[PDB]
Design a protein around this nucleic acid. Structure first.
Ligand SMILES: [Mg+2]
Lengths: 98, 79, 1337
DNA sequence: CGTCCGAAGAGATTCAGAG
DNA sequence: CTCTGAATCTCTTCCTCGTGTGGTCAGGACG
RNA sequence: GCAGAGGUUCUAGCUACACCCUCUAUAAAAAACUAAGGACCACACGA
């Protein structure tokens, strides 16, 4: 089931529920905990942000790797923006301070 | 080639700042035209940075002072 | 980029600001054309264009026309991604209450108004009228008035009085009430009323009102006039499915809500009759309820397939909610899966990986290298080249896999070592090859087990994977210092076969020059692999200051053991390879290699030992066969004896000598005895039967049988797993757990009867279902453990705290379960340890206890070592490195920053799948006996009796250590004296288990004071000895006539004068409670230590750990003495007996209610200190923390959970339990506000109050005092200062509701918050970045 | 051609015993 | 007669990932 | 090569993630080339 880049989901999680449909394996909550237990904050951050749902992040990472500079443009997961919109739609203002 | 980073972490007793300093070194090697001081053996940047740290000539202090000197002659370039 | 996240109640004006329009048509799209509806849920003008920079009409279709709306339709033209953030609002004709605040457990709306929820959701459902501004009427502002009572009021309150109904009515109430006025009004009721429950409710109301006078929130905002809608791209039409466009989601709830709203608008403008309008308003309220949180009422609105359709709260909570499905853990790119393959040729720093998988995962890297080398000018041509799999592409691929680690990842990543880095070795095939050693760490089989591979992209990611996640860097598991890459199953069997000896083997006797000659002889085939031959070895030891000295000697050994010598590194001694080398021996070998040589030599040695073990296991041919499992010749006679015994027992039962219960017990006992006998016979036949010579007459050696080698070595198997093959399988239990009377006598080598196999499958199905439930329970426990943690990281290096926990080897009545050497290893002491020589600094104050220090401790015979515990650490928002100790994965102090909360949680939760679900005192060995806190008086028998209650025998040997520890029940007589040497095998204390003696402290004449035969104590007859014995009647049984008088026993001398307690003015009186048999009547002298009255008298599985960590109060809690003093009694057990303890000096404001059925170990004439147990049974951790202190409760919970883990043969270092408990009790309650801003009733995090009071005590001011409290993991996790962490865990609706009411701002600062956001983690490499960010602020 | 209709525990909530 | 403790009722989950299938608002005709 | 158009092919090709050249209102000497959509519920199975 190997995959590099493919079509993305509604929430913009790129792997699109992997099956016949070309997909990436769910780096679930247990694996996130496992990376947290390690001193991992760069591989975890990249694979929970620039590898999964950050559209600008994903495009920049692809252009960077094909350029040869493996540099992460962090940005922000679009899943968090989806969560903010869903909580706001309930009628609960959740926003960020600059 | 390398298998373990033990001697590197006895060189840098943090195991976390080591990753940061070697990542800065690899960034200098890739983005910049910086020549690695240890000659490579068909090795990637991320492992040759650890090789540099292993010999003890590259760590946070030397890297910081080196980039500071480069910035100094960057101001001094235009006099 | 952005600062802390804040959450607050959404003002209607804020909602208007959010919305870029207002939806009016319920319809979403046209089916005629997939164009969106002009005023519908999917709309271009409201939510932006459907296509990338094109209008609906198409007048403007280029990027240059950005920022200008259309003309005929007036729709903005911008990016389609703008459609994912533009929101809209619904102008509800009638205001509707938000269900989250309405049907909340505390009912925010109801609590704020201080009126019952029944009334609230009655007036919401338009079936009772509330009375807005009642004014000059009998009815008040908060008053219920249903239809008939409303008409009764209206017909005779026809004045300007108004009583509005509906959600609009509650909006009117909320507008009318002033929050500050209510607070200042209820302040005096709080200060006046002394009722605990009533004041608790008043404080709960005051908290809600204060949380609204502080936050910028209005109570009226709970009722929502406008309902926001999501951006259409967040709730899309769903795939066409051939144009079908159909799914029961938010779109459907929004459609129905808009339909009801339009109906209400039409009815309001039409002036419809009030009954129809009221019914339609109720329908709209129900629709909004279903939209926000479906299932929060009786009927969850149901779409197609008759299933509850997902709401706006079903997608924020639960496993499938956005949090745990898309934020906490999300699917990733550069990922692939396949079944796994052994591939022993690999080294643990590397793994096999298929060519296709490396081609697909590393596609961007291959494209970049192709562009750099100019093989393909463009990405597009390079992508075609990758599809053609041209030979040049493979050579490029080999370049990008030279030093590019990949993260091998098994699906159930129970602990930290579940995911590890590897250097991929390109293999042809389709199965990932996983190194054999790391399979035990992964808990991975080769039976279709699949594990994902992830590709770190950035230099930081690959570099930290190489530095941390490599299997070379993970040798010791985080749970315990023991190695995790130990030879597990097959290589250990090969080593065990290698390191043995025949008493007569080929090539035995000749001397060998060295291991090279041993290999030469074995390979040439002229000498057996294991023959006892003397060899010369150059053993290297580093006894010098790091220098390795060489020792050459002729050590008698075998050829096989000599073979391993060339494998081991120089530093290791030969004494470690000279044994049979089972699993435990190899584990100890690897641990010694790690602790002596280091890491790289340990890695190389592990690889070489794996190679040799596999090779010589292949050469061994350790097969399995029928003849390899031997049936004992005595098994038949044992079975015959058991059948005869059960026949005799059944015959006895038939006559009637033994009833069913004792017959069942006897049969079970004799069958167990027969099972033990047949097991011993099997072991004798399997390890002793082997007869082989020594070129002489006869000799007997340890067996070389296949199954014995595969079981004794620890390669794979156990005692029961080998018993079930040759010996009797044993008594097998029914589903309910009660044992089948007749066991499965037949073993697996022979056949099994059909009933025998039926009992076997009963047991097997029970075990399988138990495992299926237990894995889910362990997963839930691991989640709770991780989430009570993940805010605890090593933020400092030291704190200079002298506090800690006194580490003592644990004794539970038996032998030493864990020696102090393995209990304090890797932890930094708090105070200087001293040997028997006093004022001796054997170990300094703040030195980590590595292997050398622990070895020094054993030879100096230390008993108890005070050590710095993570609980005692005073660091805020984390702990210091010294208070934690060794990393347990690397041989040094924990790195400043490393996340230890998650490490501890995973270490605790990993063995959850391996857990389960369901006299006299005799000295063991020679040693001295001394008692702690003991009061004894010599009796006339020359023995010893105890006056205290917590006297507890500790057996001190000649080394000074405590070999044994036994609990002494009250009144138990001690045969030996204090400090008297005893010989193991004889009882020192014995007592009657069903008797509580009232032994007298001082001998003398005792007069029966207040003893009446007939009223208080009746003189019952005796039908056993002929002499009547006085038995004190029970208080409940006896009437009030004989109950008011207090029974007592006064002590007097021969002259009749009272005898006083030595040193106490109180006479030595003794109270006789109910059911007390007094054989000795009046006029009888009593010696010291003579009994006066003979007063007559659990789980250890995963649920026990869950209860311990959730701090569940036991069903029969043990009562602990809240205050220290003498005991007095009050009520005559009027339903609930009350007990009062009064100190000699202080006041006695404490009274406790105790039920009559509870046994009391305390009387009214003894002194009990605070925390001493009163009743009997399990004691709740809350009481232990309240009375005995935080250290005591931490020790109690650590010991209990370790004892639970001990029975399953799994060892977890106590620091993990300690840090989890520290996270449990991080909350505190401020008993006295003092000068702090914190209120008394308020509970705040212990870090907050500690910082505040330390700042107050820094200057001349006096800080506020607090009372720490212990709460469970599932309660400590939700009750956290971070709303975005508690919301992601559990009860998301409640947490979000409380946060929105509070207006509390989350400051991130925790691992899981920064994970949800997607920024750097304050755990490893991100800790330095976060500390730089903090120092830059 | 478009448009309108089990189970397990915790906590809130009654609810009750006793002066 | 007003709270106390206690029974009652209601909420809130109850592992973690894969791979094959199959079923899903369903406006419908009229200006 | 960043706002548009044209070119030798093949309707259309202006960096749309995207591939060559020209200039700011004008269309051709020129070979390698092209496309940027996609959910939930149930079943069975594996670890
Ligand atoms: Mg398996």
């Amino acid at each position: 089931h190997a995959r590099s880049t493919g079509s993305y989901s509604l929430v913009t999680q790129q792997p699109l529920g992997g099956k016949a449909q070309f997909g990436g394996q769910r780096f679930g909550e247990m694996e996130v905990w496992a990376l947290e237990a390690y001193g991992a904050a760069y591989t975890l951050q990249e694979m929970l942000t620039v590898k999964s749902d950050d559209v600008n992040g994903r495009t920049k990472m692809y252009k960077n790797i094909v350029d040869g500079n493996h540099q992460m443009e962090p940005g922000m997961p679009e899943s968090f923006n989806v969560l903010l919109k869903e909580i706001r739609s309930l009628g609960i203002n959740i926003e960020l301070e600059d | 080639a390398r298998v373990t980073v033990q001697d590197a972490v006895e060189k840098i007793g943090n195991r976390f700042d080591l990753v940061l300093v070697a990542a800065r070194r690899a960034r200098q090697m890739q983005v910049g035209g910086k020549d690695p001081l240890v000659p490579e053996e068909n090795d990637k940047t991320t492992v040759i940075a650890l090789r540099e740290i292993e010999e003890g000539l590259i760590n946070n202090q030397i890297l910081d002072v080196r980039e500071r000197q480069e910035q100094q002659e960057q101001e001094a370039a235009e006099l | 980029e952005f600062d802390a996240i804040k959450i607050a109640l959404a003002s209607p004006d804020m909602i208007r600001s959010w919305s870029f329009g207002e939806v009016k048509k319920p319809e979403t799209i046209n089916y005629r054309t997939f164009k969106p509806e002009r005023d519908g849920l999917f709309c271009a003008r409201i939510f932006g264009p459907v296509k990338d920079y094109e209008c609906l009409c198409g007048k403007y279709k280029r990027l240059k026309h950005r920022g200008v709306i259309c003309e005929k339709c007036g729709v903005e033209v911008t990016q389609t991604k703008v459609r994912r953030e533009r929101m809209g609002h619904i102008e509800l004709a009638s205001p509707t209450a938000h269900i989250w605040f309405l049907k909340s457990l505390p009912s925010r709306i109801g609590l704020l108004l201080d009126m019952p929820l029944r009334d609230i959701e009655r007036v919401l459902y338009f079936e009772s009228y509330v009375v807005i501004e009642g004014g000059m009427t009998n009815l008040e502002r908060q008053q219920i008035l249903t239809e008939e009572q409303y008409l009764d009021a209206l017909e005779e309150f026809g004045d300007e009085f108004d009583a509005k109904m509906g959600a609009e009515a509650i909006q009117a109430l909320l507008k009318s009430m002033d929050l500050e006025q209510e607070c200042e009004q209820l302040r005096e009721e709080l200060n006046e009323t002394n009722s605990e429950t009533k004041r608790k409710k008043l404080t709960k109301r005051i908290k809600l009102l204060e949380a609204f006078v502080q936050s910028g929130n209005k109570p009226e905002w709970m009722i929502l006039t406008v309902l926001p809608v999501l951006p259409p791209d967040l709730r899309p039409l769903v795939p066409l499915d051939g144009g079908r466009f159909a799914t029961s989601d938010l779109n459907d709830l929004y459609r129905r809500v808009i339909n009801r709203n339009n109906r209400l608008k039409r009815l309001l403008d039409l002036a419809a009759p009030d009954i129809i309008v009221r019914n339609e308003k109720r329908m709209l309220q129900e629709a909004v309820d279903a939209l926000l949180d479906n299932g929060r009422r009786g009927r969850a609105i149901t779409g197609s397939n008759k299933r509850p359709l997902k709401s706006l709260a079903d997608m924020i909570k639960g496993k499938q909610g956005r949090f745990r499905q898309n934020l906490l853990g999300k699917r990733v790119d550069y990922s692939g899966r396949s079944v796994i393959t052994v591939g022993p040729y690999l080294r643990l720093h590397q793994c096999g990986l298929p060519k296709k998988m490396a081609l697909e995962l590393f596609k961007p890297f291959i494209y970049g290298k192709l562009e750099l080398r100019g093989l393909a000018t463009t990405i597009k041509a390079a992508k075609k080249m990758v599809e053609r799999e041209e030979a040049v592409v493979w050579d490029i691929l080999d370049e990008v896999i030279r030093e590019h680690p990949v993260l091998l990842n098994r699906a159930p990543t129970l602990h930290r070592l579940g995911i590890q880095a590897f250097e991929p070795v390109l293999i042809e095939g389709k199965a990932i090859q996983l190194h054999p050693l790391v399979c035990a760490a992964y808990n991975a089989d080769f039976d279709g087990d699949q594990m994902a591979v992830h590709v770190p992209l950035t230099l930081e990611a690959q570099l930290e994977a190489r530095a941390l996640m490599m299997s070379t860097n993970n040798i010791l598991s985080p749970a315990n210092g023991e190695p995790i890459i130990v030879p597990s199953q097959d290589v250990v069997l090969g080593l065990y076969y290698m390191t043995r000896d025949c008493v007569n083997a080929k090539g035995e006797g000749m001397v060998l020059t060295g291991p090279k000659e041993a290999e030469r002889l074995y390979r040439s085939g002229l000498a057996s692999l294991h023959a006892r031959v003397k060899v010369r070895i150059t053993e290297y030891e580093k006894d010098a200051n790091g220098e390795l000295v060489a020792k050459t000697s002729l050590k008698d050994t075998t050829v096989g053991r000599a073979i391993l010598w060339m494998i081991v590194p120089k530093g290791l001694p030969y004494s470690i390879v000279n044994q049979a080398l089972g699993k435990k021996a190899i584990s100890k070998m690897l641990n010694t290699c790690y602790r002596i040589l280091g890491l790289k030599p340990t890695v190389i040695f592990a690889d070489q030992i794996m190679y040799t073990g596999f090779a010589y296991a292949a050469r061994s041919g350790a097969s399995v066969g029928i003849d390899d499992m031997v049936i004992p010749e005595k098994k038949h006679e044992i079975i015959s004896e058991a059948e005869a015994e059960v026949a005799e027992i059944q015959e006895q039962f038939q006559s009637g000598l033994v009833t069913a219960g004792e017959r069942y017990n006897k049969v079970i006992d004799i069958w167990a005895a027969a099972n033990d006998r047949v097991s011993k016979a099997m072991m004798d036949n399997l390890q002793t039967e082997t007869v082989i010579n020594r070129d002489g007459q006869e000799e007997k050696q340890v067996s070389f049988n296949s199954i014995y080698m595969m079981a004794d070595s620890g390669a794979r198997g156990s005692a029961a797993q080998i018993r079930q093959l040759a010996g009797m399988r044993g008594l097998m239990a029914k589903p309910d757990g009660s044992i089948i009377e007749t066991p499965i006598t037949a073993n697996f080598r022979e056949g099994l009867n059909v009933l025998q196999y039926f009992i076997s499958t009963h047991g097997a199905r029970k075990g399988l279902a138990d495992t299926a439930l237990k894995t889910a329970n362990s997963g839930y426990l691991t989640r709770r453990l991780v989430d009570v943690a993940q805010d605890l990281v090593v933020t400092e290096d030291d704190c200079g705290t002298h506090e800690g926990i006194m580490m003592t080897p644990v004794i539970e009545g038996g032998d030493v379960k864990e020696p102090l050497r393995d209990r304090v290893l890797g932890r930094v002491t708090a105070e200087d340890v001293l040997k028997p020589g006093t004022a001796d600094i054997l170990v300094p104050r703040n030195t980590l206890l590595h292997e050398q220090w622990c070895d020094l401790l054993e030879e100096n015979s230390v008993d108890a070592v005070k050590v710095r515990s993570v609980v005692s650490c005073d660091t805020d928002f984390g702990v210091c490195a010294h208070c934690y100790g060794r990393d347990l994965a690397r041989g040094h102090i924990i790195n400043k920053g490393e996340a230890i909360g998650v490490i501890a949680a995973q270490s605790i939760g990993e063995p959850g799948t391996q857990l389960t679900m369901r006299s006299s005192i005799q000295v063991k060995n020679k040693g001295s006996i001394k008692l702690s806190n003991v009061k004894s008086v010599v009796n006339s028998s020359g023995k010893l009796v105890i006056t205290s209650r917590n006297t507890e025998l500790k057996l001190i040997d000649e080394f000074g250590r405590t070999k044994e520890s036994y609990k002494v029940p009250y009144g138990a007589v001690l045969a030996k004296g204090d400090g008297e040497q005893v010989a193991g095998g004889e009882t020192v204390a014995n007592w009657d288990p069903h008797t509580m003696p009232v032994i007298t402290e001082v001998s003398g004449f005792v007069r029966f004071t207040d003893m009446i035969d007939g009223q208080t104590i009746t003189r019952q007859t005796d039908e056993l000895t002929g002499l009547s014995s006085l038995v004190v009647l029970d208080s409940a049984e006896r009437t009030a006539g004989g109950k008011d008088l207090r029974p007592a026993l006064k002590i007097v001398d021969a002259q009749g004068n009272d005898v006083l307690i030595p040193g106490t003015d109180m006479p030595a009186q003794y109270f006789l409670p109910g059911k007390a048999i007094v054989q000795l009547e009046d006029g009888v002298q009593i010696s010291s230590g003579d009994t006066l009255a003979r007063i007559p008298q659990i789980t250890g599985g995963l649920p026990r750990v869950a209860d311990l960590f959730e701090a569940r109060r036991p069903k029969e809690p043990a009562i602990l003495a809240e205050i220290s003093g003498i005991v007095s009694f009050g009520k005559e057990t009027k339903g609930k007996r009350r007990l009062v303890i009064t100190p000699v000096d202080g006041s006695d404001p404490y009274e406790e209610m105790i039920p009559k059925w509870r046994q009391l170990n305390v009387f009214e004439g003894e002194r009990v200190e605070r925390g001493d147990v009163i009743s009997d049974g399990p004691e709740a951790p809350h009481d232990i923390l309240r009375l005995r202190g935080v250290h005591a409760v931490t020790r109690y919970i650590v010991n209990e959970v370790q004892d639970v883990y001990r029975l399953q043969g799994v060892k977890i270092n106590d620091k993990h339990i300690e840090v989890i408990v520290r996270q449990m009790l991080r909350k505190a309650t401020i008993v006295n506000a003092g000068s702090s801003d914190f209120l008394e009733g308020e509970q705040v995090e212990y870090s907050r109050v500690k910082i505040a009071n330390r700042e107050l005590e820094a200057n001349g001011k006096v800080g506020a005092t607090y009372s720490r409290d212990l709460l469970g993991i599932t309660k400590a996790s939700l009750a956290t200062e971070s709303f975005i962490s508690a919301a992601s865990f559990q009860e998301t609706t409640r947490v979000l509701t409380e946060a929105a009411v509070a207006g509390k701002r989350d400051e991130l600062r925790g691992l899981k918050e920064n994970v949800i956001v997607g920024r750097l983690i304050p755990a490893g490499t991100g800790y330095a970045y976060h500390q730089d960010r903090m120092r830059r602020r």
